């Protein structure tokens, strides 16, 4: 077939009941994740091709970066709670991997302040139980698929994208194959 299990996607042996329709995982420490987001814009090109009524969920993970990796999962919870993902994703990636100026929780907070989130608003979110719940949700979704590597994307708890199996040497063609595969899975 044109789309083949083991080719552009694999099939989870233990499918996850009640999972998000389209679930992406990343770390701000993850070099391929920087490429996926900052250079290929995978999330955006996937989102822009999802069928009507299909939503995209994107969560951070703890298993890279030790202490600071957990702080970033908490900050991503703050970004989701405040709805400022589109303001902070670029400076967080660049702060961790390009300028390497993010070395502490305070340096993460500086990115939000520079992006125009008020200090009071950030600190309130950071310490909130709504954010603790969002951290818990991020951790559970990753645990449910026994996640040990990023970037990763899952569709309906059943299928895992396999970009290494998208047989093209062109990066924009790669991006659109990836997006077209998510659309195909979402329709399955
Ligand atoms: C987690 O899996 C991965 O990260 C790998 C990454 C590269 C690989 C190459 N096949 C597609 C392709 C062709 C040409 C260029 C680029 C490209 C440009 C900036 S980053 C990657 C990708 C497939 C997936």
From Swiss-Prot:
UniProt record similarity statement: Belongs to the thioredoxin family. DsbA subfamily.
GO biological process: one example: cellular response to antibiotic
Main function: Required for disulfide bond formation in some periplasmic proteins such as PhoA or OmpA. Acts by transferring its disulfide bond to other proteins and is reduced in the process. DsbA is reoxidized by DsbB. Required for pilus biogenesis. PhoP-regulated transcription is redox-sensitive, being activated when the periplasm becomes more reducing (deletion of dsbA/dsbB, treatment with dithiothreitol). MgrB acts between DsbA/DsbB and PhoP/PhoQ in this pathway.
Taxonomic source organism: Escherichia coli (strain K12)
GO molecular function, one term: protein disulfide isomerase activity
Subcellular location: Periplasm
Disulfide bonds: 30-33
Domain Thioredoxin: 1-131
Alphabetic keyword roster: Disulfide bond, Periplasm, Redox-active center, Signal
Disruption phenotype: Induction of the PhoP/PhoQ two-component regulatory system, suppressed by 50 uM CuSO(4).
UniProt name for this protein: Thiol:disulfide interchange protein DsbA
A single Gene Ontology CC term: outer membrane-bounded periplasmic space
């Amino acid at each position: 077939a044109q789309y083949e299990d083991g080719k552009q996607y694999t099939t989870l042996e233990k499918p996850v009941a009640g999972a998000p329709q389209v679930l992406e995982f990343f770390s701000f420490f993850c070099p391929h994740c920087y490429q996926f987001e900052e250079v290929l814009h995978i999330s955006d090109n996937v989102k822009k091709k999802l069928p009507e009524g299909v939503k995209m969920t994107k969560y951070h993970v703890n298993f890279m970066g030790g202490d600071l990796g957990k702080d970033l999962t908490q900050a991503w919870a703050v970004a989701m709670a405040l709805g400022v993902e589109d303001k902070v994703t670029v400076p967080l990636f660049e702060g961790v991997q390009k300028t390497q100026t993010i070395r502490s929780a305070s340096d993460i907070r500086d990115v939000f302040i520079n992006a125009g989130i008020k200090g009071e608003e950030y600190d309130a979110a950071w310490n909130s139980f709504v954010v603790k719940s969002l951290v818990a949700q991020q951790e559970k979704a990753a645990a449910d698929v026994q996640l040990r590597g990023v970037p990763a994307m899952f569709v309906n708890g059943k299928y895992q994208l396999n970009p290494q199996g998208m047989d093209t040497s062109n990066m924009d063609v790669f991006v659109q194959q990836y997006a077209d595969t998510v659309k195909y899975l979402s329709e399955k």
